[PDB]
Amino acid sequence: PHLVIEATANLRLETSPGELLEQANKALFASGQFGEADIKSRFVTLEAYRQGTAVERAYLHACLSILDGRDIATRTLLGASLCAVLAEAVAGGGEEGVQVSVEVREMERLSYAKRVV
Amino acid sequence: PHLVIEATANLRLETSPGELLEQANKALFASGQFGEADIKSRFVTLEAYRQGTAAVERAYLHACLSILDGRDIATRTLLGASLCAVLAEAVAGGGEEGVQVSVEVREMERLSYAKRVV
Amino acid sequence: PHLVIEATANLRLETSPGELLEQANKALFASGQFGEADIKSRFVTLEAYRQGTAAVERAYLHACLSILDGRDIATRTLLGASLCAVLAEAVAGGGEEGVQVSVEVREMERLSYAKRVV
Amino acid sequence: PHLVIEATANLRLETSPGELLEQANKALFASGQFGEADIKSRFVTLEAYRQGTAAVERAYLHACLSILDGRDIATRTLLGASLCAVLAEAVAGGGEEGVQVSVEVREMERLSYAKRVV
Amino acid sequence: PHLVIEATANLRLETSPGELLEQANKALFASGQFGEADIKSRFVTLEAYRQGTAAVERAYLHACLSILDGRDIATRTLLGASLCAVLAEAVAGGGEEGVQVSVEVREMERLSYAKRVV
Amino acid sequence: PHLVIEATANLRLETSPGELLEQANKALFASGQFGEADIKSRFVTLEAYRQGTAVERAYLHACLSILDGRDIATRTLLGASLCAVLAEAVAGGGEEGVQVSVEVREMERLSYAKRVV
Amino acid sequence: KDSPIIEANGTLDELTSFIGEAKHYVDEEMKGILEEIQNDIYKIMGEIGSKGKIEGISEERIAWLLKLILRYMEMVNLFVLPGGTLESAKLDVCRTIARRALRKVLTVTREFGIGAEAAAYLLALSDLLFLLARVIEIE
Amino acid sequence: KDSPIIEANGTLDELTSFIGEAKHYVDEEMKGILEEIQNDIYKIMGEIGSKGKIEGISEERIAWLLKLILRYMEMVNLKSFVLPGGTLESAKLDVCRTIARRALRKVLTVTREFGIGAEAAAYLLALSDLLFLLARVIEIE
Amino acid sequence: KDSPIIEANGTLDELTSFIGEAKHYVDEEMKGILEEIQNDIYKIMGEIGSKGKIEGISEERIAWLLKLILRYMEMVNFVLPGGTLESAKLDVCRTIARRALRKVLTVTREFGIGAEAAAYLLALSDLLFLLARVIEIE
Amino acid sequence: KDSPIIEANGTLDELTSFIGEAKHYVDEEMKGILEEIQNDIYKIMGEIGSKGKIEGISEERIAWLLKLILRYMEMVNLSFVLPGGTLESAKLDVCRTIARRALRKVLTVTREFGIGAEAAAYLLALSDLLFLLARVIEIE
Amino acid sequence: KDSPIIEANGTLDELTSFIGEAKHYVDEEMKGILEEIQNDIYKIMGEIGSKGKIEGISEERIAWLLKLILRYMEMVNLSFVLPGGTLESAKLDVCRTIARRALRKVLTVTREFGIGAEAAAYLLALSDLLFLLARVIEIE
Amino acid sequence: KDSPIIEANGTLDELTSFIGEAKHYVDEEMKGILEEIQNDIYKIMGEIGSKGKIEGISEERIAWLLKLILRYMEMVNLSFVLPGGTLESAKLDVCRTIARRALRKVLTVTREFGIGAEAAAYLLALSDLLFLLARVIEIE
Amino acid sequence: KDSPIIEANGTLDELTSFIGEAKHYVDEEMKGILEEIQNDIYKIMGEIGSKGKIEGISEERIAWLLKLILRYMEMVNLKSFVLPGGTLESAKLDVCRTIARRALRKVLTVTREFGIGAEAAAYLLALSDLLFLLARVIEIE
Amino acid sequence: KDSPIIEANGTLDELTSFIGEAKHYVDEEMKGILEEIQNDIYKIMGEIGSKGKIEGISEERIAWLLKLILRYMEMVNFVLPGGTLESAKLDVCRTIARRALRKVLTVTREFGIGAEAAAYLLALSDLLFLLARVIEIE
Amino acid sequence: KDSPIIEANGTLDELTSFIGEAKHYVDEEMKGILEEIQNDIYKIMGEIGSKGKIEGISEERIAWLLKLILRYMEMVNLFVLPGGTLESAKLDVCRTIARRALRKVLTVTREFGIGAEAAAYLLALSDLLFLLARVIEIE
Incomplete structure (x- = not known):
């Protein structure tokens, strides 16, 4: 699976990006749905961003892409698990609360290619 | 919803990324489909890019709007059209030929989407 | 179509990102499914990344090809296989173990997709 | 059709096997379902047999009629009843208790059935 | 598969039961549907028999091939035809009129069939 | 139900046909599917037989005919039960292993006639 | 009360009534046979109407018809047209009705699994x- | 034009014809009753054939049958099941009865699918x- | 034989039997007509039963009925069925012929056979x- | 991951768990029998979950249960009795009713996919x- | 041997077995009540298994449960409580949930075959x- | 009162009852955890029974289970083991298999009505x- | 007129045509065999096309193929899988084989739906x- | 595209390829005819593939085939297929054209397009x- | 033994046979390529016939075809009619069959979820x- 975490530049985290990614991988691994070496995560900081039309804001968004063929309970729980990890890593940012969210999307399985060099 | 705008490095905009993002959020807000504080947009400049196989210098602008599911096709089509027009008018030019501008509107599974506020 | 290639910072490629993107566009063009000027690709290097939980230096390469919908499975599967082979050939190595290379082929809703040329 | 009649060695019949088979063929012929020369029957005496687990001398008579398929249930049921009555009448007795007499009517797949005359 | 060949006592064969059974097994083996060691055949001579109701002396030969299920009709029909030709060819004659030769091909339920080797 | 056991002439059993039939009836009775007095078994020795096209061989085959209206578990188990009984009765025969098998077939119920004299 | 149960009893009733008419055109021996048939045709209606709850005709009745069939x-000497005499015509009508009754009984058998002996009886009757x-x- | 309409009229016609035969085996009183019945059947056929556009039998006809039923x-006085056809003449009426029941079944099919003929069905039931x-x-007698 | 085929032959058999009874209540001329009809019905049953494999009634038979119809x-020159006992028997036969027709038409609609038979039965009624x-x- | 495959494994898991409880109420001999049964159930679950790709229980296991059945x-010697004469026997009656529920689910799988006939026979013998x-x- | 008939008897058997266990955790009075219940369940199973051919429980049995219900x-006096306040009560809460499962299966049978309405009423009162x-x- | 709504609540009730029994075989800490679970199940039943009209469990509850899971x-440290190593553990293995059955029923409800996704996630985490x-x- | 009848004859025609080509790449003996086969195919087409009203191949024809099969x-003597087309001439027969199999599939559809052609299917199977x-x-060689 | 559109173009492509082979076994006159046919087939594929949006063969093409048919x-003046090697190739093409027709007719029945194409293919066979x-x- | 499994193997067999003919009309290099293709098809047939139980072609084979495609x-110079020469005609026929094989393989993929690589291979092959x-x- 692939996990992409996008944070705004003005977001302050409790931990470094490194640490957050490690926690996220532990949380995903612990779900029992993935092989250890398959979980690939990456952290991205956004410098050009805007939230809404109105006030300084910050946000954190993650998107987990998994291969398809899982049920809704599994996807919902993976979402809930990561969201909690991400949320606890937020110290704050901007002048309002920080929205944290997680999308869990499925990748078509039959067409997915994978090779190891 | 989440809006990601990717531009090539050689694309010249009429205005700054900041202003473009603000215009995009206004355009989305105005659709009536979203709460003001939920519209999250981000702009990305691409340094390593190619378009086609021809040697002519090119530039492009692409946006992808992710919205929660449960909307009809008219709504999605119109959101696409609305943003595309905003993006197109922000382009001054770039490269040796016309700039391609496009918008994808994708739905995010609603039941599995997690959200909370710190 | 849009091709995004993400590589970790510690990945070593045989060729520059420029060269990789050109090869990828040739590979896609050759499929016969796309117009030459429509193939848009971009390369991204990741500085903050982790793979798995084990304390082993690792590197990876991932690509995601987004195409408009309406194609069959053979076509999508083959596009995946074609790109994956290109990406794999370009890897020199990186980290302390083999490099995983993968390709996702996803469809973009056609009716809602906007496109303009400036 | 094929009629196989199996009797235990200790069964006593009112008539010889020859006579029983002739009566059985008349009974089947009379049904109107068969050509005269097609009705083939055979009688078998069983020397090694056991009925149930109780230590009681027993005897039995069983017949199995195989007909080509394509007949209804009334026809099959009646063929069964007809033969069973003949077989029952022919039993004088045997063993230390009443003799069970039964008839199975089974269908043979028609399309695969081969028949030649030398 | 199991092949049972029943001949009347007054049937004259060109060859012995032994040779007939060997020919039958070759014919079945040659169909490509069976393993060599699985083809089990047996020959039975009938002493008590009747055919029809007419007093003319008659003779017959009948075989029944039992195979596991899951085969199509062409296969079953052909197995029938193959054996029937062998059996017919092997008949010299018997009785006062032509000999009827027939073959039934029946399927055995596969899931419930038990088999082991001692 | 009717049980027919066919053995080749060169098959050697541990016990007599009599004893084999009694064991088979006990095994069937024990299934709970049959009345005691209804189980009718018979043993047949084959003098003219051939197995395969190649070697002296022997075999043992049984066919159990029961009235229809039973499920697959029941039929499968009846098959398995008898097969085990038959197999343990085999001492050997021929120059190869002895194949032992059991067919369980259903008899049409509505058309089946039964009378007692 | 299921559609085919009702229709089958209806037809069996109709059959019995036609036999009831025919029996006044035959001699004492055939009359006695036909009355036994009407009784047997009633046990058949009980079984069908009750969807098998009530026992119908025994194997003895089928055996009885078969014995008469062989006797006759x-x-x-067994093509003629139906109705050579008036009296025989009445029985040809009864025959065609018995076949109609059979078709309805078979529908019941196929749908509910009951009446196989009844169907056999009706077949033998025809x-x-x-x-x-x-x-x-x-004669 | 619809299968069940056609079939029901067919059966009612057949019923009427059987009554037409039976009426030659009964006395003057019963003959008069049977002819009234044949006329009522024609009214029923009109209603069914026309799919309810033509009025059928009145409530008075059902009431008439009920009065005859009580009279009879x-x-x-029956104590147990009797076989059909005790006399030749009674046999004819038992045949008519079984046909009326067949007519009823066909009429009920029409009623269930089209909503017409409930009185006709009641009449046929009373007739049986x-x-x-x-x-x-x-x-x- | 599928269901419509069986049911149609059943009904045609029943029709023939009813005619067989009625013919003992009519005079020599009508009896001769009714016997010709019973033979034609058998010819129809062959065709229906064999699903068209066996030829049925020729066009001459329909023409024959039509000639008789014009004669009569x-x-x-509305009456209730059964004015006399003898006429009653023919009214019963008529209603059965119509039942036979309905069954034959079902066969025709499903299998494409029997149109002449249906025409014959219609003319017969x-x-x-x-x-x-x-x-x-008279 | 077809509905009936999932449901059958679910039930077999539930069966195994109930046996796992019952085994603490029986003596050493019956405990050993019940542990063998739990192992056999796992083999059955493998076969069903994999839709026949993984081999399940051998004919030896069915033969083993049949031998125990004759032993017992x-x-x-039974007339009619109610379930649960003693506490320990009650646990086994509960296990029996579950094994039958497992069988019904396995049979559904067999009917639709053609797999599990031996498993169904085993479960039947087990009950x-x-x-x-x-x-x-x-x-005793 | 229609699917829902089999499934309903299966569940009723399972119910009876659970009661059979629970009866060893209650006093003499409740034990006697539970044994009467197990006997009534067998009558219900007869009726369902035979598709109405065999008479089931009489109106007396339903009346009996209703009298006990009023007694109890x-x-x-209850607010909201969680299941299993004591070990013994827990066993009866498990039996209750099973009786409801049995009811659902019996109702399916009633809806499709028209039989078992009293059985369903009994099971409802039982729960x-x-x-x-x-x-x-x-x-206490 | 749709079939799957009823069946899912039925199963959740059954789950709660089994937990109610198991809690008498565990220590004070696990008992407290199990009581919290029984309360959460009631919230789930409210949501399902009312077809989403009544709010169910919060995201906090799922997060709570996940924290306990990491703690445990x-x-x-496990290879393969059979269910029921001790009597007390057996009770929890039975509860686990039931929670999975509850999940299957909840998922049916989610698939047809669009409700209960969090409930399903909770039940999954619970198992x-x-x-x-x-x-x-x-x-230990 | 029925889809599967038409499709099956179509395929049998196609088979015959392919054999017609292949027969120019074989020797006199095999050519004679292939022409007998083309004639048998026409008999099959008659039967299928006529929905069983025209007799097809006699039993002797299957027996004939079986005798040739044993001869050959x-x-x-093959030990393992060989690729199709070892020589040009053999390639033509491998193509014919694959078509006969296609013809069989179409004939079996006809058999399953209409109950005809079981011998034809057996013949085509033996032919393959x-x-x-x-x-x-x-x-x- | 919809199953039958795809399948029909597939078959028409296969037909064209078989003609492409056959044309190397015939003389200059027949070769010219066969090349005209291959061009017409492409025109048909355009129409079928585009669901009627693209015009297919004109009526002149059917008229052209009919003129050739009368000429020939x-x-x-019954024979088995393949009297000579060259004729065999054309018999194979014929059987394929009929297969193409069956697929085109399915398209016509489902979508209402291709009737002229079907007529052309029929005339071609x-x-x-x-x-x-x-x-x-010759 | 499911209808689409059988039909797909049938078509793949037919494809292989046509290639088997075409290989006698090409030079040594193309012949070698075509024989490798016939071997790959055999592996595909194994996978389909066994409904995925037997492994089919590796990603190496698809990569191999793609390399040849780029080479060629x-x-x-890439409209002409099929069959410019006799030898090229044989390959155009093989191409149209490979597409027919693909359509049948895709039906299998859609119904059973197997054969996606096979379908990709067949597509690349065409x-x-x-x-x-x-x-x-x-040339």
Whole structure:
């Protein structure tokens, strides 16, 4: 699976990006749905961003892409698990609360290619 | 919803990324489909890019709007059209030929989407 | 179509990102499914990344090809296989173990997709 | 059709096997379902047999009629009843208790059935 | 598969039961549907028999091939035809009129069939 | 139900046909599917037989005919039960292993006639 | 009360009524046979109407018809048109109705699994009625 | 034009014809009753054939059959099942009875699918009961 | 034989049997007509039963019924069924012929066979009607 | 991951768990039998979950249950009795009813996919063994 | 041997077995009640298994449960509580939930075949009685 | 009162009852966890029974189970083991298998009505927690 | 007129045409065999096309193919899978074989829906086996 | 595209390829005819593939085939397929044209397009038959 | 034994046979390529016939075809009618069959979820066969 975490530049985290990614991988691994070496995560900081039309804001968004063929309970729980990890890593940012969210999307399985060099 | 705008490095905009993002959020807000504080947009400049196989210098602008599911096709089509027009008018030019501008509107599974506020 | 290639910072490629993107566009063009000027690709290097939980230096390469919908499975599967082979050939190595290379082929809703040329 | 009649060695019949088979063929012929020369029957005496687990001398008579398929249930049921009555009448007795007499009517797949005359 | 060949006592064969059974097994083996060691055949001579109701002396030969299920009709029909030709060819004659030769091909339920080797 | 056991002439059993039939009836009775007095078994020795096209061989085959209206578990188990009984009765025969098998077939119920004299 | 149960009893009732008419055109022996048939045709209605809860005709009744059939086949030269005499005509009508009753009974058997003996009886009956009609024409 | 309309009229026609035969085996009183019945059947056929556009039998006709039924029940004493056809004449009425029941089944199919003919069905049901009683009366007398 | 085929032959057999009874209540001329009809019905049953494999009635038979119909229409001027006992028997036969027709038409609709048979049965039901009226008149 | 495959494994898991509880209420001999049964159930689950790709229980296991059944039938004499004569026997009656539920689910799988006939036979034999063991406890 | 007939008897058997276990955790009075219930369940199974051919429970049995229910309601005062206040009451809460499962299966049979309405009523009343008995144990 | 709504609540009730029994075989800490779970199940039943009209469990509850799961995973080291190593662990293995049955029923509701996704996630996490708690008892 | 009847005859026609080509790449003996086969195919087409009203191939024709098959099996010794087309001539027969199999599938559809053609299907099955062997014989020789 | 559109174009492509092979076994005149046919087939594929949006063959093409058919019928007097090697190739093409027709007709029945194409393919299968016979004769 | 499994193997067999013929009309290099293709098809048939139980072609085979395709596109001027030469005609026929095989394989993939790589291979194959045919005409 692939996990992409996008944070705004003005977001302050409790931990470094490194640490957050490690926690996220532990949380995903612990779900029992993935092989250890398959979980690939990456952290991205956004410098050009805007939230809404109105006030300084910050946000954190993650998107987990998994291969398809899982049920809704599994996807919902993976979402809930990561969201909690991400949320606890937020110290704050901007002048309002920080929205944290997680999308869990499925990748078509039959067409997915994978090779190891 | 989440809006990601990717531009090539050689694309010249009429205005700054900041202003473009603000215009995009206004355009989305105005659709009536979203709460003001939920519209999250981000702009990305691409340094390593190619378009086609021809040697002519090119530039492009692409946006992808992710919205929660449960909307009809008219709504999605119109959101696409609305943003595309905003993006197109922000382009001054770039490269040796016309700039391609496009918008994808994708739905995010609603039941599995997690959200909370710190 | 849009091709995004993400590589970790510690990945070593045989060729520059420029060269990789050109090869990828040739590979896609050759499929016969796309117009030459429509193939848009971009390369991204990741500085903050982790793979798995084990304390082993690792590197990876991932690509995601987004195409408009309406194609069959053979076509999508083959596009995946074609790109994956290109990406794999370009890897020199990186980290302390083999490099995983993968390709996702996803469809973009056609009716809602906007496109303009400036 | 094929009629196989199996009797235990200790069964006593009112008539010889020859006579029983002739009566059985008349009974089947009379049904109107068969050509005269097609009705083939055979009688078998069983020397090694056991009925149930109780230590009681027993005897039995069983017949199995195989007909080509394509007949209804009334026809099959009646063929069964007809033969069973003949077989029952022919039993004088045997063993230390009443003799069970039964008839199975089974269908043979028609399309695969081969028949030649030398 | 199991092949049972029943001949009347007054049937004259060109060859012995032994040779007939060997020919039958070759014919079945040659169909490509069976393993060599699985083809089990047996020959039975009938002493008590009747055919029809007419007093003319008659003779017959009948075989029944039992195979596991899951085969199509062409296969079953052909197995029938193959054996029937062998059996017919092997008949010299018997009785006062032509000999009827027939073959039934029946399927055995596969899931419930038990088999082991001692 | 009717049980027919066919053995080749060169098959050697541990016990007599009599004893084999009694064991088979006990095994069937024990299934709970049959009345005691209804189980009718018979043993047949084959003098003219051939197995395969190649070697002296022997075999043992049984066919159990029961009235229809039973499920697959029941039929499968009846098959398995008898097969085990038959197999343990085999001492050997021929120059190869002895194949032992059991067919369980259903008899049409509505058309089946039964009378007692 | 299921559609086919009702229809089958209806037809069996109709059959019985037609036999009831025919029995006044035959002699004492055939009349006695036909009355037994009407009784047996009633046990059949009980079984069908009750969807198998009530026992129908025994195997003895089928055996009885078969014995009569053999008795009569032995004296019948067995194509003619139906109704050679008035009396035989009545039995040919009964025969065609018995076949209609059979078709309805078979529908019940196929749908509910009951009535196989009844169907066999009705089938044998239609054969007996045929032969009796021919006997009248011959005699 | 619809299958069940056609089939129901067919059966009602067949019923009427059987009554037409039976009426030659009964006395003057029963003959008069049977002719009234044949006329009522024609009214029923009109209603069914026309899919309810033509009025059928009135409530008075059902009431008429019911009065006859009571008249005859008072004169019929059965203790157990009797076979059909005690006399030749009664046999004809038992045949008519079984046909009326067949007509009823077809009429009910029409009622269930089209919503018409409920009175007709009631009439045919009452008719079946009357024909039964008349047959028994002949055997008794 | 599928269901419609069986049911149609059943009904045609029943029709023939009813005619077989009615023919003992009519005079020599009508009896001859009714026997010709019973033979034609058998020919129809062959065709229906064999699903068209066996040829049925020729066009001459329909023409024959039509000639009789015109003969009788010329002699016939609402009545209830069964004016006389003899006419009643033919009215019963008529209603059965119509039942046979309905079953034959089902066969025709499903299998494409029997259109002439259906035409014959239709013409027959008209002839039987007229013959019944003729008996009452005479 | 077809509906009936999932449901059947679910039920077999539930069966195994109930046996796992019951085994603490029986003696050393019956405990050993019940542990063998739990292992056999896992083999069955492998076969069903994999839709026949993984081999399940051998014919030896069915033969094993049948031998135990004869051993125990010889020691059991019953008229009608209610479930649970003793606490320990009650646990086995509960296991029996679950084995039958597992069988019904396995049969659904067999009917739709053509797999599991031996498993179904095993479960059927198991429900008979569990019945007898329960009666034996009450007797002893 | 229609699918829902089989499934309903299966569940009723399972119910009876659970009661059979629970009866070893209650006193003499409740044990006697539970044994009467197990006997009534067998009558219900007869009726369902035979598709109505065999008579089931009489109206007397339903009346009997209702009398017990009133007896116990008079002694039970509840706010919201969780299942299993004591070990013994827990066993009856499990039985209650199973009786409801049995009811659902019986109702399916009633809806499709028209039989078992009294059985369903009995099972419904039973699930109410089992609830009250459990609460009584916790109270006492 | 749609078939799957009823069936899902039925199963959740059954789950709660089994937990109610198991809680008398565990120590004070696990008992407290199990009581919290029974309360959460009631919230789930409210939501399902009312077809989403009544709010169910918050995201906090799912997060709570996940925290416990990590706590316990850190203390559990397993190869393959059979269910029921000890009597107490057996009770939790039974609860686990029921939670999975509850999940299957809840998912049916989610698929047809669009409700209960969090409930399903909770039940899924619960079945993982119950597994670990059982193993912990056997280890300790 | 029915889809599967039409499609099956179509395929049998196509089969016959392919054999017609292949027969110009074989020797006199095999050519004679292939022409007998083309004639048998026409008989099959008659039966299928007429929905069983025209008699098809007699039993003797299947017996004939089976005798040829045994003749040729005795001369063919394969140890493992071989690719189609070892020689040009054998390739033509491998193509014919694959078409005969396609013809069989279409004939079986007809048999399953209409109950006709079981012998035809058996013939086509035997034919597929014969064509296989003839191809191998050419490569061997 | 919809199953039958795809399948029909597939078959038409296959037909064209078989003609492409056959044209190397015939003389200059027949080769010219076959090349015209391959061009017409492409025009048909456009129409079928585009669901009627693209115009297909004009009526002149059917008229052209019919003229050739009459020309050849005048020169042609039961035979097995493949009298000569060259004629065999055309018999194979004929059987494929009929397969193409069946697929085109499915498209016509479902979508209402391709009736002229179907007529062309039907006429083509007749022409190919005659050309094959002509080769054997000559 | 499911209908689409059988039909797909049938078509793949037919494809292999047509290639088997075509290989006698090409030179040593193309012949070698075509024999490798026939071997790969055999592996595909194994996978489909066994409903996925037997492994089919590796990603290496798809990569191999793609390399050949690029090799040939570089030397092909890429509308002509099929069959410019006799030899190229044979490959155009093979191409059309490979597409028919693909359609049948895709039906299997859609119904059973197996064969996606096989379908990709067959798709790539139909492209290679096209180019090889053009190469023959050019050369």
